[PDB]
Design a protein around this ligand. Sequence first.
Ligand code: H35
Ligand code: H35
Lengths: 262, 267
Amino acid sequence: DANKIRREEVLVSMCDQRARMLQDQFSVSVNHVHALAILVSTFHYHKNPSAIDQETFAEYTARTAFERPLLSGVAYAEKVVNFEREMFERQHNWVIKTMDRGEPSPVRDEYAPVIFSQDSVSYLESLDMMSGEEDRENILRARETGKAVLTSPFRLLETHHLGVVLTFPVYKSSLPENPTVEERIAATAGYLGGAFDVESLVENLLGQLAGNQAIVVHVYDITNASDPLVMYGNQDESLSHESKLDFGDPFRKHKMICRYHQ
Amino acid sequence: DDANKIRREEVLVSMCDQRARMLQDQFSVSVNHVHALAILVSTFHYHKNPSAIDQETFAEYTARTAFERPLLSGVAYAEKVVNFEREMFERQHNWVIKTMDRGEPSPVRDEYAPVIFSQDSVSYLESLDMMSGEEDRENILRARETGKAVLTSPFRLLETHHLGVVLTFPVYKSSLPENPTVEERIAATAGYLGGAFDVESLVENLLGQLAGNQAIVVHVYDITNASDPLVMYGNQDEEADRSLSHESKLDFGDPFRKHKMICRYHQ
Ligand SMILES: c1coc(CNc2ncnc3nc[nH]c23)c1
Ligand SMILES: c1coc(CNc2ncnc3nc[nH]c23)c1
């Protein structure tokens, strides 16, 4: 009887600690990605001529990789509307490519080609981030809301690891104060994004912890309560505990669930 | 009764430990973002040809990112200038290196650390030799010799006279060897990225928003020297409960310094 009580208390403690650790690391990453969005705005748009380039972005992001613990890499995609495509591709000496096959993009109203990338995600360069549905939806919500947004869990490029993408908007100085959504769209310069590689880096975070073999941990995206999506853990459908997670995007909801094996 | 007294201590422990965690975490976040600024100056001012950082750019970026550094009133970048170079440096900048105590032209020194970039919140630092204050000077030396973020003892900051501490990071030239000796670090020093932890104002602001703040008295001490504890935050001597206290752990990240928090009831 006393033993059941102690067992419950240990589960709550273990689960709550893991949830705090994960929320905190996510939070630190989001904050540092916000700083990068501000850096691109200040150095690429506010300065004339631009005082940021791929070499500099690669260096800075490499040297600050420690500031973004759950992220496999960061990249900056620029907003390009179709009338500007020819000039853009001539300036960059490359063609805007599709994410799925790396083929030259068919005509679209607009694109979000990656122009700067951390070398860890170098394969993103020139890819149109609107040619992937999760990234596209993220890009639109980022620019319309003015804030960091997260995707549902999905399998990331190259590694195929299950993760979530974080996108921040970057705006031109023409953005009015207290802007409408329409004003936000018009003033959009691009999108600073990062991949939370949950499958690998959350596993590295949690798997090293004492007691890991005694409990089963899942993280769910419960944005749609009738359709919970696994973000971390196995696909399995008594004694559990739900620990709170808040990853900072009001559009999404998450939770951690822990159980004992036996 | 004896039940209520046990619970009274339990609440003090919880309140004090939570406040200590908050202080430690917020300082850690600030230190990490100062580290990123040091890397920014290295990458964008030194490595990039030409430099992308002038005073206007530094002021803008630091203002827009001030939320990243919650326990800091301002940040600035001081460049290492040896005396051989002083006249050249002053001619290029069209200003003279000044002392921090009176803003007067600096006397001849072997070297200087004049502020060349500043967040507007600490704009009065521009052109001041940060080696002309003892706390800042010792911090600069330990920063460059160790390669890590360092903290001063508590002292009254320039202009505000608020009781605080200074955080200083070294910035090195690309000539810094792998696995450098201290002598190599000194030779490769470019300058120093510093930030003012205005403990008196900003820790009061942090604590005063918390529920139960009126019930508790919070002090923070620098206990680097056991026999000479130094007040970092708090009063005396205040109307405080002498019968019960709690000590909460604090670690601000510099192994050269030690700190602790003590809470008591107002009662
Ligand atoms: C700009 C907008 O969104 C991004 C990051 N998206 C992203 N990064 C890394 N791997 C990915 N795989 C799919 N989408 C990915 C950069
Ligand atoms: C470079 C080296 O150290 C600094 C920060 N020092 C500092 N900042 C703001 N107020 C001060 N008052 C004394 N020292 C101060 C900048």
